[PDB]
Amino acid sequence: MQDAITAVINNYDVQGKYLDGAALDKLKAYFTTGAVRVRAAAVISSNATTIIKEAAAKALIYSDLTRPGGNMYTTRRYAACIRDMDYFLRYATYAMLAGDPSILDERVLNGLKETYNSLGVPIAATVGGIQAMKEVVGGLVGPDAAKEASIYFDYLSSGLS
Amino acid sequence: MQDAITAVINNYDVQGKYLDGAALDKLKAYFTTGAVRVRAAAVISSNATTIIKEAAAKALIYSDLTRPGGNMYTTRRYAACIRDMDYFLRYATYAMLAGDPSILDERVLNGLKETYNSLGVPIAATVGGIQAMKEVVGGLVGPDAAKEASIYFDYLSSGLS
Amino acid sequence: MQDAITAVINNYDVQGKYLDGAALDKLKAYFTTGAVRVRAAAVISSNATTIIKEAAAKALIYSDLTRPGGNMYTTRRYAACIRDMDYFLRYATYAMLAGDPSILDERVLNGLKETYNSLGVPIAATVGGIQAMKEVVGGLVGPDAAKEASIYFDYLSSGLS
Amino acid sequence: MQDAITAVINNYDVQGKYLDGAALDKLKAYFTTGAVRVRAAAVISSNATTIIKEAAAKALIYSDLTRPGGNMYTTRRYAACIRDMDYFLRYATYAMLAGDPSILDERVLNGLKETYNSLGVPIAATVGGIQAMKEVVGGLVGPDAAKEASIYFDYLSSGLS
Amino acid sequence: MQDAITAVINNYDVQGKYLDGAALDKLKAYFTTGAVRVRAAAVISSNATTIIKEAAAKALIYSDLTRPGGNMYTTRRYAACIRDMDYFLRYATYAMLAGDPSILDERVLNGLKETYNSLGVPIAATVGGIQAMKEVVGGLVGPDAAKEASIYFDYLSSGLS
Amino acid sequence: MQDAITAVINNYDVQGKYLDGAALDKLKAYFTTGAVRVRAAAVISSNATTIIKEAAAKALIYSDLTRPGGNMYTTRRYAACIRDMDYFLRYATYAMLAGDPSILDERVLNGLKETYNSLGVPIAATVGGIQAMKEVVGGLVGPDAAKEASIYFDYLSSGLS
Amino acid sequence: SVLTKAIVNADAEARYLSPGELDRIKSFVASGERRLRIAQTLTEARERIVKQAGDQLFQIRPDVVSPGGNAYGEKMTALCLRDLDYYLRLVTYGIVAGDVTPIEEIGIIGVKEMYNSLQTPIPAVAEGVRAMKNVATSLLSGDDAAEAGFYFDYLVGAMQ
Amino acid sequence: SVLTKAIVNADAEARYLSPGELDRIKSFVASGERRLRIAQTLTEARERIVKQAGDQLFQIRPDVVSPGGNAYGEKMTALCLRDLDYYLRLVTYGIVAGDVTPIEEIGIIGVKEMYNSLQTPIPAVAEGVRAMKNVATSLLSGDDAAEAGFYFDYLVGAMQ
Amino acid sequence: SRYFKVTACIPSLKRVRTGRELQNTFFTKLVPYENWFTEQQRIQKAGGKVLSVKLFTGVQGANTGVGA
Amino acid sequence: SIRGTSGSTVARPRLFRTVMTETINGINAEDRYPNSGEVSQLDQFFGD
Amino acid sequence: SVVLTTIMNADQQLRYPSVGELEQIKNFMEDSALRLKVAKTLSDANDRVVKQASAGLFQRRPDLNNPGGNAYGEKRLGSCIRDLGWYYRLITYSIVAGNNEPVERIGLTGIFEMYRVLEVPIPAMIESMRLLKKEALELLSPAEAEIAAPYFDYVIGAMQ
Amino acid sequence: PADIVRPSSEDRPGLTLPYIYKLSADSLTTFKMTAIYGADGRPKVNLS
Numbered sequence A, B, C, D, E, F: 001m002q003d004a005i006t007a008v009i010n011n012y013d014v015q016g017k018y019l020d021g022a023a024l025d026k027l028k029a030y031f032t033t034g035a036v037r038v039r040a041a042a043v044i045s046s047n048a049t050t051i052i053k054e055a056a057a058k059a060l061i062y063s064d065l066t067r068p069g070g071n072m073y074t075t076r077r078y079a080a081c082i083r084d085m086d087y088f089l090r091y092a093t094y095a096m097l098a099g100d101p102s103i104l105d106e107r108v109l110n111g112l113k114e115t116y117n118s119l120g121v122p123i124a125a126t127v128g129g130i131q132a133m134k135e136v137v138g139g140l141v142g143p144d145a146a147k148e149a150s151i152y153f154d155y156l157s158s159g160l161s
Numbered sequence G, H: 001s002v003l004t005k006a007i008v009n010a011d012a013e014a015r016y017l018s019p020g021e022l023d024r025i026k027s028f029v030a031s032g033e034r035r036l037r038i039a040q041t042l043t044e045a046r047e048r049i050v051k052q053a054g055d056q057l058f059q060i061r062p063d064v065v066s067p068g069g070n071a072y073g074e075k076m077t078a079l080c081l082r083d084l085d086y087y088l089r090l091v092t093y094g095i096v097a098g099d100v101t102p103i104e105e106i107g108i109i110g111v112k113e114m115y116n117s118l119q120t121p122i123p124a125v126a127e128g129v130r131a132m133k134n135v136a137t138s139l140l141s142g143d144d145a146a147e148a149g150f151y152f153d154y155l156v157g158a159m160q
Numbered sequence I: 001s002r003y004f005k006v007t008a009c010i011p012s013l014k015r016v017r018t019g020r021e022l023q024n025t026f027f028t029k030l031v032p033y034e035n036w037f038t039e040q041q042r043i044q045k046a047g048g049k050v051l052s053v054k055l056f057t058g059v060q061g062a063n064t065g066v067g068a
Numbered sequence J: 001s002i003r004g005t006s007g008s009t010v011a012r013p014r015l016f017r018t019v020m021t022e023t024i025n026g027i028n029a030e031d032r033y034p035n036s037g038e039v040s041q042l043d044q045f046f047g048d
Numbered sequence K: 001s002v003v004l005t006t007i008m009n010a011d012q013q014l015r016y017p018s019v020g021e022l023e024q025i026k027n028f029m030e031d032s033a034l035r036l037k038v039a040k041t042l043s044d045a046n047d048r049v050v051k052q053a054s055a056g057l058f059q060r061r062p063d064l065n066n067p068g069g070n071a072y073g074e075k076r077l078g079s080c081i082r083d084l085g086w087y088y089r090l091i092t093y094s095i096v097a098g099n100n101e102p103v104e105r106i107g108l109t110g111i112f113e114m115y116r117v118l119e120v121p122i123p124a125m126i127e128s129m130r131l132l133k134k135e136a137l138e139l140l141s142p143a144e145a146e147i148a149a150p151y152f153d154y155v156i157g158a159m160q
Numbered sequence L: 001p002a003d004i005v006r007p008s009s010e011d012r013p014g015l016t017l018p019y020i021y022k023l024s025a026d027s028l029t030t031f032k033m034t035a036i037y038g039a040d041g042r043p044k045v046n047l048s
């Protein structure tokens, strides 16, 4: 997988061009903002469980999904969905730190859509939980990294749907 | 897999028949060429690296495959391609000594086209390299086993294509 | 492990010597007796179960070993004893083929006396069974390879006892 | 400890059985080789120090064992190694006289390996010295008792290894 | 494995005290000697192979280790050297980057004497080889950084012997 | 046991080298600090009982240790505990004089942990007493030998804990 | 057979065919003529050997031709003779094939489950195979009969 | 420490220290003086920080110091303050080391099992650590306050 | 108790293994539910992709019969 | 230095193959006795 | 890159980045402003440094441009110079990257295997990379030389 | 052909072996099963 720097490096290596003004501009644009990415990642790591809590509270729980009959019935399915929620949050944080969605395209979306189809998982409910996580994360991190996290959250949600 | 003797023996076992005149003629036809196969296999085993070098120089090197954007670009992919070249040469020697492409179907061609499609490897380039190995092997072995060697390389090329 | 040829070559290598007349004469003696060992090993491999058959019938069963309280009592212990006896026969065959007891010392004799002491296996009874297969093998193979077979069984019996 | 006669007597006493033809044959087999063992034991007893000297010259000394950093370096360690060598020779003589390695099991090999591991002594070098004494004794005694002497040195070497 | 920073903390933790003046002096000393270590590590790297070759020529080669019988007589025994070495470098370059013996006792120098005793491998020779590399690295690295590299090499040699 | 001078001599003898510049500099490094060590040892010997009294007052007595249920309760156990304190102080003095903790490893810490666990002695309380003695000794001796004295008390404490 | 085992072992070793490994190939191609001659000499008397092994087996085991046996009745006796012909065909297959692999893959793996489901004496079948070996050894020459008896005794040990 | 995490990372591949690792080790040795000064400043004010943090914690969560509380009683409160002092010591160790490696092995692995066995409120302990963080950040300049507080949030997140 | 029937390819890109690497670069194998997550994560970590996943063994209702 | 030991052993490293050891080790790895085709290998090897 | 290396460890151990890991991730970017012009100067010499390195290595080892040499002829010299340019480009990609990633992942893992069938001397490439490392620092200041020397050391430390 | 590198983890060191050292060994008999073909299938199959 790739981040901003590695993406620039191999995207130039494919046609064998040295780093030019546009390439150094892209690298500078990445380096000028990643410190806010570091702060947002630290805040997200410190508040991971609360984010999954509020996303589940405002998007999944108190519903027929958690009622008998939904996908979120039984503590086993509850723990599985919350573990999936945690995995989505952590990979979103990795994507935000890296500044490239290749990490999501490889270690997140690969073998997930058809797996959810075969397991009967509600894709709409999963997308709603992802947007709940994005809302909570944007509330926590602040204006500095809100859009930076939101773009990759939207990437994951659009990949799922 | 099966050789000539094992193939005829199994074909007679499925019908439950003692070995007959036609099976005896087939066995004699295999036995009369036993020594030449051994000599050809010894020559190819002793000259194996040189065949790969000449085939690579005549087929895949000095082209866009080695340049950036090529499948064989980077030392990992170059070593992988030459290792596949050695695989093809060794298994061609196996098929030529055994007198049967059953091992070629069983342990080489099985899923090879689909895995090359998944990885993006140039099937036409691999076919050209295999034909270069066939030419070099036919040159080195001599009249005695040239066409016996070349039929199995043709089998590999036709299975790939 | 090592055999006659490997032992001789390493014994002259450790000194740093060319293979002289005495070494070539020892290889003379080993090579002149080769086919007898091969036919003896083929006979042993073909009659392995029956050699154990008569060996057990003449040395172990119909005694206090198989009755309750005996070591070889119960189906588990009977199967284990016969598997051990077959192990001894097969490794004696390997030693006879190699013309050296190094394999027997390396992979059978070490840990054997200590394991049998740990588990309570009668070493005297095991030596009796080995002598039983020695007699049976001497009967089967005949004058050609009788002594050459019996020497490694005697080595195994002496190492155990 | 036990010799061949005492071993047979114990094997029959544990069954509470009078001596039968098999026990008589085993005792006769020991009796027919009594004199050769006595002659060999006298030979080793007469030439004790020369055997140790030749074994040390052939396998131990003039190496890194006797140089600084070696385990045989310094007068104390040299004396210890030669005294161990003498112990091995004497108990090998006892075992060859008694026709049974039980004395070697009881008084030498029991805990010798773990003592050597604690002290840092090289077990490989010790095995080499034991074999060197083995060939020296085999040369001295002659064909009559060569194998009978050699079996117990091999037993000691296998027990150490 | 421990460095100075971890060692002080571990020593001050078992007795449950805050970092006092002595601990801050030790950490301050390491932090002040933190640049020459980094520079000399890079100097040891790059010129690693020439260091090994010069040390081998100075100590190992031109002795009994190369003649017939030595433990570097042939290649692959020669090849186990350069290897064997490259450790004793690599390690102790780690030591003079996270300066504390620790790593040298836990990864390299621990049971090495047992392995060498079971494999031959003259310990005095492999310690002379260590001192040769000590001299060559003291020459290459510089006046002040010749020490503490001499310290770790001396620790390695002393521990091995 | 071994000291600075004997340690240098042994670590040169096991490698079979003569006294070189490094060992010479080590030995003058010990020689330069001879007077400070002997002066500190004389001070400690003159103030032996007062140091133990003050350390016991600061760390052990006037607590639950000397009350019933404490390990230091009863005259026999009180005398044994102060004897142990004298042990630690005297061996620390020997180690300070010799400039080597080898005497501490050989004659103090070997099996002390298991002995204390068998007897039920509080190891944490013992380490606290050792540290109190170290503080008092550092007060008495002064900056001249305070660090050298403290390193061996710290070695004892780290070994015990 | 021999070629299959050699190539399988070499490929498991992840190397070319060993110079020693090709030696078995050369020996096989040398001895192919002799083994083919022995194979035809066995195949020229399939029913006669089955006959004589029939007398030997019936005389040695009246158990099998007993009322409690499985050969009681001409139909099942004919079935037993057909099984003996099957095993003679298998052994001549192995003789031509040089390795016992066809014999193993036709008639000894699961043969115990075979004859246990059919309720038939494995020792009786082994005795019949041994009588077949004796008749064949009488019908061939001693040196080639050594290898033929090697195959036959491998079969006898397999059904036991 | 960072030296531990860097040297052992370049030892699992059988290579020397990477040129990418002949960096941030350098940044660590450069910032070592600042880290030592921050650790000494925290150590000097250990009693004030512990006392004020315990005060804030007991106001925020008065149920723990109630009769049905885990820390009810003068010596049970003494044990709570001792635990807070322990965590302050671990934070100073982490600050000097430059990594949370030592505090992780010393006081985080198994803390859930220990506090569940003792029946102590882990969220209450986390709030106590947060109060210690606030009191510590009140005594430091902005950069040093952030540097110590980041380890404080590590402890808060790990106890969770 | 249910086994997913999947197919996948996994290329090794750091070691260039040199013997029989064709049976290890594309496979279909039944994998249990309890081990399917850890097995599927390995393919993504190595860098290959899963081509298909099929539940095969059981029903999507779950509840009773899940344990095994 | 050195506070614990696991002891030493008597190791026998291999210097070279020479067909006989290779054949015996290949047979031992499957634990099956020499094959019928494996038999003739020793025959012509001893004949050479 | 440094971020790629850190995220690799974090995902391998199934955890977020560490408290000592973000300290290194932030220190990797703060010197990026200085380091950007460092590789830029090396970037704007790319067809000159290797051109002057050709005469520096081919004069040292004169058997690379002789009848028995691998680079004999104009077009054979061109391939060696193009390889020097490739490695210079890769080392610049790594110096604008951080850790060994751009060179090791693309043109370092298996150079021995490439030359296994290519016949180009590794000990000659060692001196080639040594020369490149020596001829590229002089364009930089010693302050930049400290930020350049380890980045060139890795090639001649890896191929060895 | 390079040194066979055995990669290790954060607790133990990683190792390297000369190629010629393992080239003079007993050459590592291995067992591999070829049966993914299709499972439901299409290729040459047979029991192999």
Ligand SMILES: *[C@H](C)[C@H]1/C(=C/c2[nH]c(/C=C3N=C(/C=C4\NC(=O)C(CC)=C4C)C(C)=C\3CCC(=O)O)c(CCC(=O)O)c2C)NC(=O)[C@@H]1C
Residues within 6 Å of the ligand: A061, A062, A063, A066, A067, A072, A073, A074, A075, A078
């Ligand atoms: C009551 C004695 C205790 C208690 C409970 C409590 N539970 C919730 C919320 C939920 N509980 C469940 C439970 C289950 N789902 C299942 O599949 C099963 C197995 C049959 C169970 C038992 C679920 C799913 C929820 C989430 C809401 C929902 O059902 O949609 C709460 C509410 C927590 C909140 O934050 O709102 C509470 C309080 N609380 C106590 O104090 C008692 C110890």
Ligand SMILES: *[C@H](C)[C@H]1/C(=C/c2[nH]c(/C=C3N=C(/C=C4\NC(=O)C(CC)=C4C)C(C)=C\3CCC(=O)O)c(CCC(=O)O)c2C)NC(=O)[C@@H]1C
Residues within 6 Å of the ligand: A065, A071, A072, A077, A078, A080, A081, A082, A084, A085, A087, A088, A107, A108, A109, A111, A112, A115, A119, A121, A122, A123, A125, A126, A129, I033, I034, I036, I037, I040, I041, I062
């Ligand atoms: C949660 C918000 C929703 C939900 C989910 C749910 N998932 C499963 C089972 C699995 N989920 C995964 C997920 C992943 N594999 C990956 O590689 C990644 C990214 C790295 C993900 C996210 C997998 C592999 C499984 C199966 C294996 C396993 O669970 O260990 C279930 C269980 C289904 C069942 O009972 O059979 C559930 C319920 N459920 C909801 O209600 C939410 C909408």
Ligand SMILES: *[C@H](C)[C@H]1/C(=C/c2[nH]c(/C=C3N=C(/C=C4\NC(=O)C(CC)=C4C)C(C)=C\3CCC(=O)O)c(CCC(=O)O)c2C)NC(=O)[C@@H]1C
Residues within 6 Å of the ligand: B061, B062, B063, B066, B067, B072, B073, B074, B075, B078, K064, K070, K071, K076, K077, K079, K080, K081, K083, K084, K086, K087, K090, K106, K107, K108, K118, K120, K121, K124, K125, K128
């Ligand atoms: C130059 C200092 C040395 C030298 C080199 C040399 N190289 C070649 C040919 C090739 N070199 C490569 C190299 C790479 N491909 C990659 O992907 C990478 C990683 C970035 C490298 C380094 C390749 C692929 C070739 C083949 C041709 C092509 O690129 O298409 C030659 C020519 C060999 C020939 O047979 O013609 C030479 C001579 N020679 C020396 O003497 C120097 C020590």
Ligand SMILES: *[C@H](C)[C@H]1/C(=C/c2[nH]c(/C=C3N=C(/C=C4\NC(=O)C(CC)=C4C)C(C)=C\3CCC(=O)O)c(CCC(=O)O)c2C)NC(=O)[C@@H]1C
Residues within 6 Å of the ligand: C061, C062, C063, C066, C067, C072, C073, C074, C075, C078
């Ligand atoms: C009887 C219904 C069948 C039968 C049996 C038969 N058995 C033997 C010989 C032995 N049987 C055993 C059995 C066991 N050993 C154990 O540990 C156990 C488990 C408790 C058993 C069942 C043993 C050890 C022997 C060997 C002699 C001995 O005991 O010392 C024979 C004799 C075989 C021969 O002499 O060759 C026979 C005949 N025979 C039938 O026809 C019945 C179907």
Ligand SMILES: *[C@H](C)[C@H]1/C(=C/c2[nH]c(/C=C3N=C(/C=C4\NC(=O)C(CC)=C4C)C(C)=C\3CCC(=O)O)c(CCC(=O)O)c2C)NC(=O)[C@@H]1C
Residues within 6 Å of the ligand: C060, C065, C071, C072, C076, C077, C078, C080, C081, C082, C084, C085, C087, C107, C108, C112, C115, C119, C121, C122, C125, C126, C129
């Ligand atoms: C049989 C004639 C005698 C006998 C034997 C007996 N052995 C065991 C158990 C074991 N035997 C072995 C032997 C070997 N493993 C090897 O690798 C080799 C050399 C290649 C040998 C010789 C081992 C390892 C075991 C233990 C594990 C196992 O059972 O497989 C038993 C079983 C003991 C028990 O019940 O625990 C027996 C009975 N017993 C006699 O009475 C005969 C004299």
Ligand SMILES: *[C@H](C)[C@H]1/C(=C/c2[nH]c(/C=C3N=C(/C=C4\NC(=O)C(CC)=C4C)C(C)=C\3CCC(=O)O)c(CCC(=O)O)c2C)NC(=O)[C@@H]1C
Residues within 6 Å of the ligand: D060, D065, D071, D072, D076, D077, D078, D080, D081, D082, D084, D085, D087, D107, D108, D112, D115, D119, D121, D122, D125, D126, D129
């Ligand atoms: C000599 C060929 C090899 C060798 C030997 C060596 N041994 C020791 C020390 C001891 N050896 C023994 C031996 C025995 N104890 C017994 O009960 C028996 C059975 C009769 C034996 C053989 C013991 C007990 C010791 C320890 C003596 C002690 O306590 O000091 C040393 C000295 C080791 C030392 O550190 O001083 C040596 C050198 N060394 C070689 O290199 C030869 C291969």
Ligand SMILES: *[C@H](C)[C@H]1/C(=C/c2[nH]c(/C=C3N=C(/C=C4\NC(=O)C(CC)=C4C)C(C)=C\3CCC(=O)O)c(CCC(=O)O)c2C)NC(=O)[C@@H]1C
Residues within 6 Å of the ligand: E060, E065, E070, E071, E072, E073, E076, E077, E078, E080, E081, E082, E084, E085, E087, E107, E108, E109, E112, E115, E119, E121, E122, E123, E125, E126, E129, J013, J014, L013, L015, L016, L017, L021
């Ligand atoms: C070289 C100067 C000396 C020498 C050495 C030699 N060593 C071996 C074999 C091995 N050496 C090691 C060493 C290590 N493994 C570790 O993990 C470490 C520390 C991290 C070390 C130092 C081991 C384990 C072996 C065996 C396995 C292997 O080869 O990797 C040999 C080969 C012996 C043989 O032929 O069997 C040799 C020759 N020989 C000399 O002459 C020098 C004194």
Ligand SMILES: *[C@H](C)[C@H]1/C(=C/c2[nH]c(/C=C3N=C(/C=C4\NC(=O)C(CC)=C4C)C(C)=C\3CCC(=O)O)c(CCC(=O)O)c2C)NC(=O)[C@@H]1C
Residues within 6 Å of the ligand: F061, F062, F063, F066, F067, F072, F073, F074, F075, F078
């Ligand atoms: C009183 C008549 C005399 C006297 C006594 C005195 N004792 C101490 C201090 C201690 N005394 C003990 C005694 C014991 N510990 C035991 O286990 C037993 C056996 C049952 C006894 C008797 C101890 C342990 C101490 C140390 C303090 C403690 O108990 O924790 C003092 C104090 C001395 C000091 O320096 O503080 C005194 C004064 N003094 C007299 O003059 C009387 C004759």
Ligand SMILES: *[C@H](C)[C@H]1/C(=C/c2[nH]c(/C=C3N=C(/C=C4\NC(=O)C(CC)=C4C)C(C)=C\3CCC(=O)O)c(CCC(=O)O)c2C)NC(=O)[C@@H]1C
Residues within 6 Å of the ligand: B060, B065, B070, B071, B072, B073, B076, B077, B078, B080, B081, B082, B084, B085, B087, B088, B107, B108, B115, B119, B121, B122, B125, B126, B129, I010, I011, I012, I013, I016, I017, I020, I021, I022, I023, I025
């Ligand atoms: C070389 C002439 C061409 C080329 C090839 C290439 N192949 C790979 C990767 C693989 N090749 C194989 C091959 C086999 N597996 C088998 O079982 C057999 C027969 C026994 C063969 C021949 C496989 C499975 C792989 C994937 C796993 C691996 O990489 O080892 C690559 C690398 C692709 C990548 O980077 O992922 C390449 C480049 N490339 C060319 O340019 C030539 C036309």
Ligand SMILES: CCC1=C(C)/C(=C/C2=NC(=C\c3[nH]c(/C=C4\NC(=O)[C@H](C)[C@H]4CC)c(C)c3CCC(=O)O)/C(CCC(=O)O)=C2C)NC1=O
Residues within 6 Å of the ligand: E061, E062, E066, E073, E074, E075, E078
């Ligand atoms: C049996 C296979 C085999 C060989 C041959 C072998 C050789 C061998 N040659 C060596 C050295 C050496 N060999 C030579 C020279 C030469 N070498 C030659 O084959 C030429 C005839 C000659 C040059 C014309 C020199 C000069 C050295 C010293 C090292 C050096 O060159 O710096 C060394 C290093 C130890 C030593 O100095 O003795 C070995 C191991 N080992 C083996 O296992």
